[PDB]
Amino acid sequence: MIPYQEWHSQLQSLYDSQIFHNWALSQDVHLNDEKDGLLLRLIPTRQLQKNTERIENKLLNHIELYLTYSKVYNEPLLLLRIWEEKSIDGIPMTKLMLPTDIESLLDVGSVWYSFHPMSTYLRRWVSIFIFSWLGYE
Amino acid sequence: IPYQEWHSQLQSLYDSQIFHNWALSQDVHLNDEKDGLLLRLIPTRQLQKNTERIENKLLNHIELYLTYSKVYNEPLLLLRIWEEKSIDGIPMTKLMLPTDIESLLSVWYSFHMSTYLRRWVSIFIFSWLGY
Amino acid sequence: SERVLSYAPAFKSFLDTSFFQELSRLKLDVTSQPLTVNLDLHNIPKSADQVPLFLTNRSFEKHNNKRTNEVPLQGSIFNFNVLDEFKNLDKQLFLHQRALECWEDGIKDINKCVSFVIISFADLKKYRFYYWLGVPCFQRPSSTVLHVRPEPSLKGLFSKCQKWFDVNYSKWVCILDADDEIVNYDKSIIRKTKVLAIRDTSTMENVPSALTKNFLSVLQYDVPDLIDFKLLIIRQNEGSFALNATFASPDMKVSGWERNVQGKLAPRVVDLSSLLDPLKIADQSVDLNLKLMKWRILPDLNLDIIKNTKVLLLGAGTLGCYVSRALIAWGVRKITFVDNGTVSYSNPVRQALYNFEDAGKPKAELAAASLKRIFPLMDATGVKLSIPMIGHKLVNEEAQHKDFDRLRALIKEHDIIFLLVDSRESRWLPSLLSNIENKTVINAALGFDSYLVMRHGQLGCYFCHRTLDQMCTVTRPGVAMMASSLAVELMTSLLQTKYSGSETTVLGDIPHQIRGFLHNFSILKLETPAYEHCPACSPKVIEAFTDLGWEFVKKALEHPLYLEEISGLS
Amino acid sequence: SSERVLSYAPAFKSFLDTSFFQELSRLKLDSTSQPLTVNLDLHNIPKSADQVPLFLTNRSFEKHNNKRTNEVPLQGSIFNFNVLDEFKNLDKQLFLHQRALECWEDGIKDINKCVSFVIISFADLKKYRFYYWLGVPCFQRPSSTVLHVRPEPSLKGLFSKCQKWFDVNYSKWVCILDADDEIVNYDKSIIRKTKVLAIRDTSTMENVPSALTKNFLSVLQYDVPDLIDFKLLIIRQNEGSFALNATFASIPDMKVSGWERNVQGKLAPRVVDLSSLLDPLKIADQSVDLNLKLMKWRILPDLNLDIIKNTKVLLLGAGTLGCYVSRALIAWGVRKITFVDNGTVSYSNPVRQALYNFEDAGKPKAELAAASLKRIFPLMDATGVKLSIPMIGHKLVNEEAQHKDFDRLRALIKEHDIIFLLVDSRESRWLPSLLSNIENKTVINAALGFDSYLVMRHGNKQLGCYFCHRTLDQMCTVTRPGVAMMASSLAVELMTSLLQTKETTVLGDIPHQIRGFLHNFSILKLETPAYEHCPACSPKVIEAFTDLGWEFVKKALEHPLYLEEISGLSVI
Ligand SMILES: [Zn+2]
Ligand SMILES: [Zn+2]
């Protein structure tokens, strides 16, 4: 565990550190209406791309990672959302998808999938829960 | 008690006119098949006091249904109670569901060797109602 | 020593509710419909002056089961669709028109001149039934009567006539031939012999059934020249009698509408509502199921205290759902749920009050509604409310303050509080409040394969002393079922008076704590003392609460150290 | 030499969050127009982007929201169409042009107000599919005017003062320096003298300012038409700032562009398909599955969930036991359940029997129980069969019908992997025990006493059945409510344990018999060998059924004395 205000400070620092902005995977990096969350829009790694073609037979447009704080568990919670690359009239379309097997799609919330649960706390958390299974830089 | 042994004693019991010669019975009849005996009885004076003391109602008559329970292979006594009222100034009878049935004495209340049925009658019927 | 012949009413009607249920059934299908009743003239109740005419659902069947000596009387029923019509119909005219059909058929065959009719109105909204029986008895001519004097010398013919009517059940009359044998009615053979028998439906002494009017009327049509004859009234009892008869003075007089209980001429009314009241039926059978546990098994078991117990449930989750189900089974009529949640799509599978379509609805209000859906008479209320966790900073201070006040109001007004919540820290605030308000408390806590059940009510509370009672714990399905029922069984066992000198009650042991385990299938029982240093118990904490109120609550929640220091636990 | 024609990068890179479309569906239920507001973060821009991301959410529909300190509020609007064809048929060049005219009419009054964005959209609420196209009005007046520039490194000293000035005034897109050499708000009389202009740049590309620069320069040519030569500063919050010696040249008329190109680099609308949110069945199924998986990966890795999910379970009886067992089964992930019961729902039934409501009275129990399972979890494969199970020690009411029921019962036992005998009494247990023994199926027995219960398993040295060796299982017996819950949970827990490789499993012990008692709150676990003379298991009885078929059953039912003879228990 770790206090809400300690996490609020470290999130803004990590955000302003541009460590996510300098990431090759990130299309966009943004805080929510509050400063208490961080939404990461990411370019799919090659391995994820290979898996969605193998497992789901579909093409992946991008994934969304949301770093949130649960005031219940007093810990960070990582929400995930997966989008499909598609088309309609010849116009490329993007579609939020609900994978048959999302465990195997990678190598391992209300509308979201979710991962389950000292000054360096958040920066280290990202290393294990994010930077481990996705390449950096 | 076997089914057929009960079927024979029910027809003997009926034909003995024991219920027909009772003072309480308005009517005695067997059902479509011979498996059962419907007793329509006049309320005893003691019952009339009770239902008026408790439910504050007048008793019209009592229907007892003597049936065979094929689950327990034993007799089962069913009970329906009727109330006296009126509508236009003429008598109306009404099936009632007593707020307390136990202290008064298919929707029916239910009670929870060759001489078998005659005994069972004396115990489960003639005891509280009287002969 | 001669007299004029009088008559008893032909029949006495009794209609079993099956007849009205069957009459109802046909009002939803499609005029008059045919009826068939078997008369038992061998056994007639003493209370009755005539053979009982008994109607049931099987009376609509054109051919049904008969006993050997019984007589299949035929009739019809006229069902009007409006009560007003039933009233406004002329009874004296209607029964006359039926008699004309009886008179008509009587000339063809003298045995077809006897029948009955039921006029009716079925009110299916109130389930109320109006019926009037009548027997088309006709005296033709109206002026012609019958003078009779007894002739006992004919008593030898009684048995011959008794066994004859028994055999032929479709025949209402018989005569003698030249050989003094019993045969069917024939206009030829009767003029010579002048002996006529009638099967009698009356038990009235020396007073034959009014049906006799019909037979004497057909006799005068067939044999107009017969003034004097002998009439046998035949009964299966000992009350048969012979009569020396004479006719003494066209127009037909029709009688035989059945009188009511008061002897007035008026319809009978049956009220079958209360078959329309399943809420009361269900209520009575349910309680009667409960009473069976008392009288048959445990005579001194107290049901009323359990029925009158007001139960507060804190949390609507798996435990709350099953606990309430075990409570309504035990006869508890008042249950109040408290939950801050909303039904998820996944919820119904482990939470027994909800369905898939119920997702998106508030749990508390819905859990209570679900109880009313199971058993419509229940005092059941949901309350959407948050219980503050200790060791966390308040999310909304003003809001949780209101919810704090609302929780105490709820605890005070309820008799027994169950703590069904998700976590250990969620138990503290209710344990404190329930301590202050002197309420009996049962806890239930779930671990992976283990469960905990204990009573606060000196024994001391939950806080008085690995996956057990944690926010993230996922449990085996069996654990929650086990803990829920043991909680309720402990609660019912707790409301029973303790036997003299021992701890036991009529329902058996009342342990302080129960801790079960799934892997080894075993139950542990432990008894713990109350502690002077407990955070939810200690007089130091209780007097701190009484003095500082919500401010003591607010600080203890956010800084447990402050609470531990007050209780002297640190 | 060392002089260029100034080029331009696209002003913005649009990202529309799913919550933005939610709010779009919500407002359509609560063509038209409506204001939008977005906060630009110009200090932190992803390296993969040539321009600042334009990010709109549900909160973008509210005119005043909470921006961070150095962020820049951007005013825009959205135009929603009610017909897909109306969206396609819109002249885009004309639409964007008349947005530019609105930016121009604003720009002459206030130069900072000439910048905005626009979204056109069509929301298909049936399919939950969304069509959007963003565009950023950019105008050149005159269209024939280009800008010749060359580097001016001497002015690099002004970069810091403009960064801080733009940070502070977040509503301002442009500043100039006055006669006092200080950064001030744009004034047409002042710029005329000093000839130095600073613009807030949204582009990260070196020496390529955002196309928005066209807007400001178009207004600069309207305000000070005689200014041919000035100094242009393009201010960025990174090291990418640059200064230019600027000249307006020729090669009125207003050119307009700025429709955003799609992921393919073509001028087309974007399309977002949210339809997967309309499938809660799939959402529920995955939720329930992952919850089960947590029992494996987090706690007991060796646990087999798949053998449980694949198990076909026959439930004999719909009563209290049948209702609680089934609920605990679906919780374990068992998807196939057949109920067998001959009853009809009583008005009093729902209170002890967990699958039924008060409104359900009068319905067949077996079907309704199955129907109720689908009401809890619609993906459940659940059926029920109205069937009689003949009691031993009783005459047969209908020989023909009970013969058929006997055949159907055996067929059902063949069809299922696990059998539960949930029946009312001992007398009803004999026949299914025999059949399951012949068909060699795993059986769980659960019997209720008043304060006690018995849960046991028929085997596959042998364990032996229910009949091998006081108010328990009596059929007149009214039981304490807690008993059935207890029995049912242990019945299922014993089952899932049994499906695991063993004599203990990953889930713990697997006893032969479990007897619990309420009065002392105790549980006993006892074993027992298969009895030789039992009139269920005994080889003489098995021999008897195989040869004689239904004729043996009919006789053993009506005359249990005959059954004791065959079993050799008679001599005992
Ligand atoms: Zn304590
Ligand atoms: Zn055996």
Coordinates of N, CA and C in Angstrom, one line a residue, chain C residues 18-162:
Chain C
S18 N -65.8 -28.5 -6.5 CA -65.3 -29.0 -7.8 C -66.3 -28.7 -8.9
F19 N -67.6 -28.7 -8.6 CA -68.6 -28.3 -9.6 C -68.5 -26.9 -10.0
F20 N -68.2 -26.0 -9.1 CA -68.1 -24.6 -9.4 C -66.7 -24.3 -10.1
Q21 N -65.7 -25.1 -9.7 CA -64.4 -25.0 -10.3 C -64.5 -25.5 -11.8
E22 N -65.4 -26.5 -12.0 CA -65.6 -27.1 -13.3 C -66.5 -26.2 -14.1
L23 N -67.5 -25.5 -13.4 CA -68.3 -24.5 -14.0 C -67.5 -23.3 -14.5
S24 N -66.5 -22.9 -13.7 CA -65.6 -21.8 -14.0 C -64.8 -22.2 -15.3
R25 N -64.3 -23.4 -15.3 CA -63.4 -23.9 -16.4 C -64.1 -23.8 -17.7
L26 N -65.5 -24.0 -17.7 CA -66.2 -24.0 -18.9 C -66.7 -22.6 -19.4
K27 N -66.6 -21.6 -18.4 CA -67.0 -20.3 -18.8 C -65.9 -19.6 -19.6
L28 N -64.7 -20.2 -19.6 CA -63.6 -19.7 -20.3 C -63.4 -20.4 -21.7
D29 N -64.4 -21.3 -22.0 CA -64.4 -22.1 -23.2 C -65.4 -21.5 -24.3
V30 N -66.7 -21.8 -24.0 CA -67.7 -21.4 -24.9 C -68.8 -20.4 -24.3
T31 N -77.6 -21.1 -23.7 CA -77.4 -22.5 -23.8 C -77.4 -23.2 -22.5
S32 N -77.7 -24.5 -22.5 CA -77.6 -25.3 -21.3 C -76.7 -26.5 -21.6
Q33 N -76.1 -27.0 -20.5 CA -75.2 -28.2 -20.6 C -75.8 -29.3 -19.8
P34 N -75.6 -30.6 -20.2 CA -76.2 -31.8 -19.6 C -75.4 -32.2 -18.3
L35 N -76.2 -32.6 -17.3 CA -75.6 -33.1 -16.0 C -76.1 -34.5 -15.7
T36 N -75.2 -35.2 -15.0 CA -75.6 -36.6 -14.6 C -75.1 -36.9 -13.2
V37 N -76.1 -37.2 -12.3 CA -75.8 -37.5 -10.9 C -76.3 -38.9 -10.5
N38 N -75.5 -39.6 -9.8 CA -75.9 -40.9 -9.3 C -76.5 -40.8 -7.9
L39 N -77.8 -41.3 -7.8 CA -78.5 -41.2 -6.5 C -78.3 -42.5 -5.8
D40 N -77.9 -42.4 -4.5 CA -77.9 -43.6 -3.6 C -79.1 -43.6 -2.7
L41 N -80.0 -44.5 -3.0 CA -81.3 -44.5 -2.3 C -81.3 -45.6 -1.2
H42 N -80.2 -46.3 -1.1 CA -80.0 -47.3 0.0 C -79.5 -46.6 1.2
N43 N -78.5 -45.7 1.1 CA -78.1 -45.0 2.3 C -78.4 -43.5 2.2
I44 N -79.4 -43.0 2.9 CA -79.8 -41.7 3.0 C -79.5 -41.1 4.4
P45 N -78.8 -40.0 4.5 CA -78.6 -39.4 5.9 C -79.9 -39.2 6.6
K46 N -79.8 -39.5 8.0 CA -81.0 -39.3 8.8 C -81.6 -37.9 8.8
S47 N -80.6 -36.9 8.7 CA -81.0 -35.5 8.7 C -81.8 -35.1 7.5
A48 N -81.8 -35.9 6.5 CA -82.5 -35.5 5.2 C -83.9 -36.1 5.1
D49 N -84.8 -35.4 4.5 CA -86.1 -35.8 4.2 C -86.3 -36.5 2.8
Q50 N -85.2 -36.3 2.0 CA -85.2 -36.8 0.7 C -83.8 -37.2 0.3
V51 N -83.6 -38.0 -0.7 CA -82.2 -38.4 -1.1 C -81.4 -37.2 -1.6
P52 N -80.2 -37.1 -1.1 CA -79.2 -36.1 -1.4 C -78.9 -36.1 -2.9
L53 N -78.9 -34.9 -3.6 CA -78.5 -34.8 -5.0 C -77.1 -34.1 -4.9
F54 N -76.1 -34.8 -5.2 CA -74.7 -34.4 -5.0 C -74.0 -34.1 -6.3
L55 N -73.6 -32.8 -6.5 CA -72.9 -32.4 -7.7 C -71.4 -32.2 -7.6
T56 N -70.7 -32.6 -8.6 CA -69.2 -32.4 -8.6 C -68.8 -32.1 -10.0
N57 N -67.5 -32.0 -10.2 CA -66.9 -31.8 -11.6 C -67.3 -33.0 -12.5
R58 N -67.4 -34.2 -12.0 CA -67.7 -35.4 -12.7 C -69.1 -35.4 -13.1
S59 N -69.9 -34.5 -12.6 CA -71.4 -34.4 -13.0 C -71.6 -33.9 -14.4
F60 N -70.5 -33.3 -14.9 CA -70.5 -32.8 -16.3 C -70.2 -33.9 -17.3
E61 N -69.5 -34.9 -16.9 CA -69.2 -36.1 -17.7 C -70.5 -36.8 -18.0
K62 N -70.8 -37.1 -19.2 CA -72.1 -37.7 -19.6 C -72.2 -39.2 -19.2
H63 N -71.1 -39.9 -19.1 CA -71.1 -41.2 -18.5 C -69.9 -41.4 -17.5
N64 N -70.3 -41.6 -16.2 CA -69.3 -41.7 -15.2 C -69.5 -42.9 -14.3
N65 N -68.7 -43.2 -13.4 CA -68.7 -44.4 -12.6 C -69.9 -44.5 -11.6
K66 N -70.6 -45.6 -11.8 CA -71.8 -45.8 -10.9 C -71.5 -47.0 -10.0
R67 N -72.2 -47.0 -8.9 CA -72.2 -48.2 -8.0 C -73.4 -49.0 -8.5
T68 N -73.6 -50.2 -7.9 CA -74.5 -51.2 -8.5 C -76.0 -50.8 -8.5
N69 N -76.5 -50.4 -7.3 CA -77.9 -50.1 -7.1 C -78.3 -48.7 -7.3
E70 N -77.3 -47.9 -7.7 CA -77.5 -46.4 -7.8 C -78.3 -46.0 -9.0
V71 N -78.9 -44.9 -9.0 CA -79.8 -44.4 -10.0 C -79.2 -43.1 -10.7
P72 N -78.9 -43.2 -12.0 CA -78.3 -42.1 -12.8 C -79.4 -41.0 -13.2
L73 N -79.7 -40.1 -12.3 CA -80.6 -39.0 -12.6 C -80.0 -38.0 -13.6
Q74 N -80.7 -37.6 -14.6 CA -80.2 -36.6 -15.6 C -80.8 -35.2 -15.4
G75 N -80.0 -34.2 -15.8 CA -80.4 -32.9 -15.7 C -79.6 -31.9 -16.5
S76 N -79.9 -30.6 -16.4 CA -79.2 -29.6 -17.2 C -78.9 -28.4 -16.4
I77 N -77.9 -27.6 -16.8 CA -77.5 -26.3 -16.2 C -77.6 -25.2 -17.1
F78 N -78.3 -24.1 -16.7 CA -78.4 -22.9 -17.5 C -77.5 -21.8 -16.8
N79 N -76.4 -21.4 -17.5 CA -75.5 -20.4 -17.0 C -75.6 -19.0 -17.7
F80 N -76.2 -18.1 -16.9 CA -76.3 -16.7 -17.4 C -75.0 -15.9 -17.3
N81 N -74.7 -15.0 -18.2 CA -73.4 -14.3 -18.2 C -73.5 -12.9 -17.4
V82 N -74.7 -12.5 -17.0 CA -74.9 -11.3 -16.2 C -75.8 -11.6 -15.0
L83 N -75.5 -11.2 -13.9 CA -76.3 -11.4 -12.6 C -77.7 -10.8 -12.8
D84 N -77.8 -9.7 -13.4 CA -79.1 -9.0 -13.6 C -80.1 -9.9 -14.3
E85 N -79.6 -10.7 -15.3 CA -80.4 -11.6 -16.1 C -80.9 -12.7 -15.2
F86 N -80.0 -13.3 -14.4 CA -80.3 -14.3 -13.4 C -81.5 -13.9 -12.5
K87 N -81.4 -12.7 -12.0 CA -82.5 -12.1 -11.2 C -83.8 -12.0 -11.9
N88 N -83.8 -11.4 -13.1 CA -85.0 -11.0 -13.8 C -85.7 -12.1 -14.5
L89 N -85.1 -13.3 -14.7 CA -85.8 -14.4 -15.3 C -87.0 -14.8 -14.4
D90 N -88.1 -15.1 -15.0 CA -89.2 -15.6 -14.2 C -89.0 -17.0 -13.9
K91 N -89.0 -17.3 -12.6 CA -88.8 -18.7 -12.1 C -90.0 -19.6 -12.4
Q92 N -91.2 -19.0 -12.1 CA -92.4 -19.8 -12.2 C -92.7 -20.2 -13.7
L93 N -92.3 -19.4 -14.6 CA -92.4 -19.7 -16.0 C -91.4 -20.6 -16.5
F94 N -90.1 -20.4 -16.1 CA -89.0 -21.2 -16.6 C -89.1 -22.7 -16.2
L95 N -89.4 -22.9 -14.9 CA -89.6 -24.3 -14.4 C -90.8 -25.0 -15.1
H96 N -91.8 -24.2 -15.5 CA -92.9 -24.7 -16.2 C -92.5 -25.2 -17.6
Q97 N -91.7 -24.5 -18.3 CA -91.2 -24.9 -19.6 C -90.3 -26.1 -19.6
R98 N -89.6 -26.3 -18.5 CA -88.8 -27.5 -18.3 C -89.8 -28.7 -18.1
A99 N -90.9 -28.4 -17.3 CA -91.9 -29.5 -17.0 C -92.5 -29.9 -18.3
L100 N -92.7 -29.0 -19.3 CA -93.3 -29.4 -20.6 C -92.5 -30.3 -21.3
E101 N -91.2 -30.1 -21.2 CA -90.2 -31.1 -21.8 C -90.3 -32.4 -21.1
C102 N -90.4 -32.3 -19.8 CA -90.6 -33.5 -19.0 C -91.9 -34.2 -19.3
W103 N -93.0 -33.5 -19.4 CA -94.3 -34.0 -19.8 C -94.3 -34.6 -21.1
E104 N -93.6 -34.0 -22.1 CA -93.5 -34.4 -23.5 C -92.8 -35.8 -23.5
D105 N -91.6 -35.9 -22.9 CA -90.8 -37.1 -22.9 C -91.5 -38.2 -22.1
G106 N -92.4 -37.8 -21.2 CA -93.1 -38.7 -20.3 C -94.1 -39.6 -21.0
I107 N -94.7 -39.0 -22.1 CA -95.7 -39.7 -22.9 C -95.0 -40.8 -23.7
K108 N -93.9 -40.5 -24.3 CA -93.1 -41.4 -25.0 C -92.6 -42.5 -24.1
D109 N -91.9 -42.2 -23.0 CA -91.5 -43.1 -22.0 C -91.8 -42.5 -20.6
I110 N -92.6 -43.2 -19.8 CA -92.9 -42.7 -18.5 C -91.7 -42.5 -17.6
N111 N -90.6 -43.2 -17.9 CA -89.4 -43.1 -17.1 C -88.5 -42.0 -17.4
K112 N -88.7 -41.3 -18.6 CA -87.9 -40.2 -18.9 C -88.5 -38.8 -18.5
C113 N -89.6 -38.9 -17.7 CA -90.3 -37.7 -17.2 C -89.8 -37.1 -15.9
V114 N -88.7 -37.7 -15.4 CA -88.0 -37.2 -14.2 C -86.7 -36.6 -14.5
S115 N -86.4 -35.3 -14.1 CA -85.1 -34.7 -14.3 C -84.9 -33.6 -13.3
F116 N -83.9 -32.8 -13.5 CA -83.6 -31.6 -12.6 C -82.9 -30.5 -13.5
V117 N -82.9 -29.3 -12.9 CA -82.3 -28.2 -13.6 C -81.6 -27.3 -12.6
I118 N -80.4 -26.7 -13.0 CA -79.7 -25.8 -12.2 C -79.5 -24.5 -13.0
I119 N -80.2 -23.4 -12.5 CA -79.9 -22.1 -13.1 C -78.7 -21.5 -12.3
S120 N -77.8 -20.8 -13.0 CA -76.6 -20.4 -12.4 C -76.1 -19.0 -12.9
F121 N -75.3 -18.4 -12.1 CA -74.5 -17.2 -12.5 C -73.1 -17.3 -11.9
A122 N -72.0 -17.3 -12.7 CA -70.7 -17.3 -12.2 C -70.0 -16.0 -12.3
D123 N -69.6 -15.4 -11.2 CA -68.9 -14.2 -11.1 C -67.4 -14.5 -10.9
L124 N -66.6 -14.4 -11.9 CA -65.2 -14.9 -11.9 C -64.2 -13.9 -11.3
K125 N -64.6 -12.7 -11.2 CA -63.7 -11.7 -10.6 C -63.7 -11.8 -9.1
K126 N -64.9 -12.0 -8.5 CA -65.0 -12.2 -7.1 C -65.1 -13.7 -6.7
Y127 N -65.1 -14.6 -7.7 CA -65.2 -16.0 -7.5 C -66.4 -16.3 -6.6
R128 N -67.6 -15.7 -7.0 CA -68.8 -15.9 -6.2 C -69.8 -16.6 -7.1
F129 N -70.6 -17.5 -6.6 CA -71.5 -18.4 -7.4 C -72.9 -18.4 -6.9
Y130 N -73.8 -18.1 -7.8 CA -75.3 -18.2 -7.5 C -75.9 -19.4 -8.2
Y131 N -76.5 -20.2 -7.4 CA -77.2 -21.4 -8.0 C -78.6 -21.6 -7.4
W132 N -79.5 -22.1 -8.2 CA -80.8 -22.5 -7.8 C -81.2 -23.8 -8.4
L133 N -81.5 -24.8 -7.5 CA -82.0 -26.1 -8.0 C -83.5 -26.1 -8.2
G134 N -84.0 -26.8 -9.2 CA -85.4 -27.1 -9.2 C -85.7 -28.5 -9.9
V135 N -86.8 -29.1 -9.4 CA -87.2 -30.3 -9.9 C -88.6 -30.2 -10.6
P136 N -88.7 -30.3 -11.9 CA -89.9 -30.0 -12.6 C -91.0 -31.0 -12.3
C137 N -91.6 -30.9 -11.1 CA -92.8 -31.6 -10.7 C -94.1 -31.0 -11.3
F138 N -94.9 -31.8 -12.0 CA -96.1 -31.3 -12.6 C -97.3 -32.1 -12.3
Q139 N -98.4 -31.4 -11.9 CA -99.7 -32.1 -11.6 C -100.7 -31.8 -12.6
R140 N -101.0 -32.8 -13.5 CA -101.9 -32.7 -14.6 C -103.1 -33.7 -14.5
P141 N -104.3 -33.2 -14.4 CA -104.7 -31.8 -14.4 C -104.5 -31.2 -13.0
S142 N -104.5 -29.9 -12.9 CA -104.3 -29.1 -11.7 C -105.4 -29.4 -10.6
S143 N -106.6 -29.7 -11.1 CA -107.7 -29.9 -10.2 C -107.7 -31.3 -9.6
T144 N -107.2 -32.2 -10.3 CA -107.2 -33.6 -9.9 C -106.2 -33.9 -8.8
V145 N -106.8 -34.5 -7.7 CA -105.9 -34.8 -6.5 C -106.0 -36.3 -6.3
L146 N -105.4 -36.8 -5.2 CA -105.4 -38.2 -4.9 C -105.9 -38.5 -3.5
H147 N -107.0 -39.2 -3.3 CA -107.4 -39.7 -2.0 C -106.9 -41.1 -1.8
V148 N -106.3 -41.3 -0.6 CA -105.7 -42.6 -0.3 C -106.1 -43.1 1.1
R149 N -106.2 -44.5 1.2 CA -106.3 -45.2 2.4 C -105.3 -46.3 2.4
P150 N -104.7 -46.6 3.5 CA -103.6 -47.7 3.6 C -104.2 -49.1 3.3
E151 N -103.4 -49.9 2.7 CA -103.7 -51.3 2.5 C -102.4 -52.1 2.8
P152 N -102.2 -52.5 4.1 CA -101.0 -53.2 4.5 C -100.9 -54.6 4.0
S153 N -102.0 -55.2 3.4 CA -102.1 -56.5 2.9 C -101.2 -56.7 1.7
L154 N -100.6 -55.6 1.1 CA -99.8 -55.7 0.0 C -98.3 -55.8 0.3
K155 N -97.9 -55.8 1.6 CA -96.5 -55.7 2.0 C -95.6 -56.8 1.4
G156 N -96.2 -57.9 0.9 CA -95.4 -59.0 0.4 C -94.8 -58.6 -1.0
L157 N -95.3 -57.6 -1.6 CA -94.8 -57.1 -2.9 C -93.6 -56.2 -2.8
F158 N -93.3 -55.8 -1.5 CA -92.3 -54.8 -1.3 C -90.9 -55.3 -1.8
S159 N -90.5 -56.4 -1.3 CA -89.2 -57.0 -1.6 C -89.1 -57.2 -3.1
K160 N -90.1 -57.7 -3.8 CA -90.1 -57.9 -5.2 C -89.9 -56.6 -5.9
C161 N -90.4 -55.5 -5.4 CA -90.2 -54.2 -6.0 C -88.9 -53.6 -5.6
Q162 N -88.3 -53.9 -4.4 CA -87.0 -53.4 -4.0 C -85.9 -54.0 -4.9

